[PDB]
Amino acid sequence: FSPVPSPEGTKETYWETKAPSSDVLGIGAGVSSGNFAAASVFAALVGGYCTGQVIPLTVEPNPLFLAGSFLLPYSWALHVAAWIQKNNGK
Amino acid sequence: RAVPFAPAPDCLPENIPGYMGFDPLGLSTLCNVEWLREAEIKHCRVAMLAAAGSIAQDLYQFPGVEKIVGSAKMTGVHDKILAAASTGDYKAQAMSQILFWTSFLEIVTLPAVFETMNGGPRKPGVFFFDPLGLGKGDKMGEMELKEIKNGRLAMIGVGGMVHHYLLTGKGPIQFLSGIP
Amino acid sequence: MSESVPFLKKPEALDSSMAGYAGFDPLGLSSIADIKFLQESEIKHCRIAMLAAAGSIAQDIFTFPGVSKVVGTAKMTGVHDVLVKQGAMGQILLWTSFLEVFGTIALLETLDGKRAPGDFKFDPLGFSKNAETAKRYQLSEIKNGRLAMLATGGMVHGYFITGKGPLELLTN
Ligand code: CLA
Ligand code: CLA
Ligand SMILES: CC1=C(C#C/C(C)=C/C=C/C(C)=C/C=C/C=C(C)/C=C/C=C(\C)C#CC2=C(C)C[C@@H](O)CC2(C)C)C(C)(C)C[C@H](O)C1
Numbered sequence: 001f002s003p004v005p006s007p008e009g010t011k012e013t014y015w016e017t018k019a020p021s022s023d024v025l026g027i028g029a030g031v032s033s034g035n036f037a038a039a040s041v042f043a044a045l046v047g048g049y050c051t052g053q054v055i056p057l058t059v060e061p062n063p064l065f066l067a068g069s070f071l072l073p074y075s076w077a078l079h080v081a082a083w084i085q086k087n088n089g090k
Numbered sequence: 091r092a093v094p095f096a097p098a099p100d101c102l103p104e105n106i107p108g109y110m111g112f113d114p115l116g117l118s119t120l121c122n123v124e125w126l127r128e129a130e131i132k133h134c135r136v137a138m139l140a141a142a143g144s145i146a147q148d149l150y151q152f153p154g155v156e157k158i159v160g161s162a163k164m165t166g167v168h169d170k171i172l173a174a175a176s177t178g179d180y181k182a183q184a185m186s187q188i189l190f191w192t193s194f195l196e197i198v199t200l201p202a203v204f205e206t207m208n209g210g211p212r213k214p215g216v217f218f219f220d221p222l223g224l225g226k227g228d229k230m231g232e233m234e235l236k237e238i239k240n241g242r243l244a245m246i247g248v249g250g251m252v253h254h255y256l257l258t259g260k261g262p263i264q265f266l267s268g269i270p
Numbered sequence: 271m272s273e274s275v276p277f278l279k280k281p282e283a284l285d286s287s288m289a290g291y292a293g294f295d296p297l298g299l300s301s302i303a304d305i306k307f308l309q310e311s312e313i314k315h316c317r318i319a320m321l322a323a324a325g326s327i328a329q330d331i332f333t334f335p336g337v338s339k340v341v342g343t344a345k346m347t348g349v350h351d352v353l354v355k356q357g358a359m360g361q362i363l364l365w366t367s368f369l370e371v372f373g374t375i376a377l378l379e380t381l382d383g384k385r386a387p388g389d390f391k392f393d394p395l396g397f398s399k400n401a402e403t404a405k406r407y408q409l410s411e412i413k414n415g416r417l418a419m420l421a422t423g424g425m426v427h428g429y430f431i432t433g434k435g436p437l438e439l440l441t442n
């Protein structure tokens with residue numbers, strides 16, 4: 001009804017192709033599909049290992065294993081980015 | 091062809107170092123050939139180091155290790171150093187050091203194996219590591235096949251050495267010297 | 271192709287004109303972040319690490335008057351704890367935070383592009399009035415800073431094992 005503002009750097013992200021344009025990856029638009037795929041497995045293995053090491057949680061947990069455990073959900077976003085880049089030829 | 095019965099798939103090109111028509115099980119149809127070539131060169135080099143180290147860890151040992159390792163042979167040394175490091179011991183971190191540096195090397199050389207599959211300039215296994223220049227200045231290509239043959243032999247040899255230890259406590263030299 | 275890593279392809283965001291260029295970006299980190307942000311960050315890490323390395327060495331060699339009775343044994347990072355109970359570390363924190371508020375502003379115009387990475391125009395003495403000696407000093411700043419980052423890691427980590435501190439660890 002009046003112009004709706006968006007932050008500067010807003011671009012069009014609507015896609016009807018096989019994969020979205022690499023612009024949907026933000027700062028990771030130039031990373032290769034191999035680099036996400038290897039990061040995806042690495043984050044999954046390290047994240048699972050760190051998660052596994054603190055499953056009985058104590059009042060003194062290792063803070064690196066807590067921080068390293070956040071790599072497991074982060075790996076999910078990594079393989080999605082790996083699939084997007086592979087299907088954009090990157 | 092290596093096996094007249096079952097020849098190699100047409101997926102394998104015949105211009106690769108070490109191509110001797112050997113793929114009866116068609117394992118190059120089940121994966122990328124560039125990945126497989128890279129994997130076998132890496133397996134070859136790791137196994138060459140493992141085999142030479144198995145022989146050397148018998149003929150001559152680095153100073154001081156007998157207090158940290160005793161008389162354990164090839165598989166045992168790994169377990170015992172990691173046992174000593176499991177206490178807080180400073181002088182038993184050889185395993186963590188080698189794992190760190192090899193992991194760091196595989197981390198920073200990791201984009202190479204994806205560039206080769208993506209059509210990149212570099213051929214499988216080539217890191218341009220020729221400090222002495224012996225292979226480069228001289229005509230190269232025989233050394234590739236020598237590397238591949240020695241690497242395949244090293245893989246089988248590591249297999250032998252390890253499993254011979256897993257049965258009898260002898261290492262390489264002890265097991266070869268006699269015949270139980 | 272890349273200079274430092276011959277197997278790897280040349281980093282797309284990295285160019286020869288930039289100081290301390292060896293074509294070294296195996297992980298392609300320059301593609302992820304804005305290059306000017308990384309360049310300012312490298313220079314900032316370099317200059318703090320040079321101060322830290324010289325500080326480690328000098329704190330081995332001599333100590334300022336009266337510090338011996340505030341802190342007796344602690345040498346590398348143990349002093350930090352003793353002085354946080356006192357007010358020394360807090361005072362340095364406050365004044366570096368002042369300088370880093372103006373560094374926040376400075377980084378904003380760097381991202382606007384009107385300021386070069388690491389360029390604070392702080393050249394009181396006449397050491398950059400050639401634009402040939404300036405480029406050599408630019409390269410030497412980057413290289414000595416990188417060496418200082420690795421050295422600061424080696425000095426503190428050596429203290430973590432031994433507690434000796436750098437030059438004492440050298441002597442014994
Ligand atoms: C798979 C490889 C492998 C593994 C896991 C081990 C692991 C071990 N070795 Mg064995 N060793 C190896 C290879 C290996 N070694 C090789 C190749 C040699 C030389 C023939 C030796 C000779 C050796 C001796 C003499 C001794 C050990 C010992 C040990 C233990 C302590 C660590 C140590 O000092 O290593 C020492 C290992 C080396 C000095 C190997 C360095 C050789 C490098 C790899 C050559 C690299 C060349 C090139 C420049 C690098 C390529 C760069 C390129 C990739 C960019 C540990 C169990 C000690 C022990 O307690 O055993 C009882 C011991 O006394 N090793
Ligand atoms: C049989 C051994 C052998 C052979 C013939 C080759 C041959 C080659 N390698 Mg490979 N390599 C090997 C083992 C070998 N390598 C091992 C074990 C490693 C792991 C450290 C590597 C790591 C490696 C990398 C990372 C690269 C090569 C490359 C190359 C090529 C050019 C370099 C060159 O000509 O050097 C010739 C090498 C030799 C003649 C090996 C010297 C062996 C000496 C004579 C004895 C070894 C002593 C050893 C420590 C064990 C002692 C005995 C023990 C029982 C005590 C060529 C195909 C490069 C390439 O493909 O592109 C250019 C490359 O980037 N290699
Ligand atoms: C590349 C390159 C460089 C380099 C380099 C390097 C590190 C080169 C190293 C090459 C090496 C280490 C080759 C070793 C291969 C080992 C083999 C073939 C063993 C097979 C075992 C068998 C057959 C067995 C056995 C058996 C026995 C005896 C004992 C029994 O109990 C067990 C069993 C019965 C099984 C340099 C630095 C030169 C620069 C250059 O510019 C580029």
Ligand SMILES: CC1=C(C#C/C(C)=C/C=C/C(C)=C/C=C/C=C(C)/C=C/C=C(\C)C#CC2=C(C)C[C@@H](O)CC2(C)C)C(C)(C)C[C@H](O)C1
Pocket residue numbers: 320321323324392393394395397414415417418420421422423424425428435436437439440
């Ligand atoms: C004049 C002035 C200017 C200025 C300025 C200033 C203050 C410039 C100061 C620059 C500094 C502080 C440079 C110091 C670098 C230290 C390095 C490279 C460390 C090397 C150590 C190594 C290799 C090691 C080690 C060690 C290990 C790890 C463990 C130890 O056990 C052993 C050991 C010690 C051997 C500016 C530009 C601001 C403007 C204007 O012009 C006015």
Ligand SMILES: CC1=C(C#C/C(C)=C/C=C/C(C)=C/C=C/C=C(C)/C=C/C=C(C)/C=C/C2=C(C)CCCC2(C)C)C(C)(C)C[C@H](O)C1
Pocket residue numbers: 164165166168169245246248249250252253
């Ligand atoms: C130290 C360490 C560990 C470890 C470990 C390791 C390294 C274990 C070793 C694993 C290996 C390398 C096994 C080898 C398998 C190769 C075989 C069976 C050869 C088949 C070839 C055949 C049948 C025929 C070949 C042929 C011949 C006859 C010639 C004609 C052609 C052909 C028909 C192809 C543990 C587990 C102890 C744990 C410990 O905490 C850390």
Ligand SMILES: CC1=C(C#C/C(C)=C/C=C/C(C)=C/C=C/C=C(C)/C=C/C=C(C)/C=C/C2=C(C)CCCC2(C)C)C(C)(C)C[C@H](O)C1
Pocket residue numbers: 194347350351419420422423424426
């Ligand atoms: C003040 C205070 C503290 C503190 C503190 C401090 C000062 C902490 C500082 C920590 C630092 C500076 C760590 C740096 C580590 C550097 C590394 C791992 C580089 C490795 C190089 C690699 C892997 C490869 C290099 C490479 C090789 C060789 C070949 C290829 C090329 C190259 C890339 C050069 C505490 C925590 C004690 C608490 C206390 O209450 C208050």
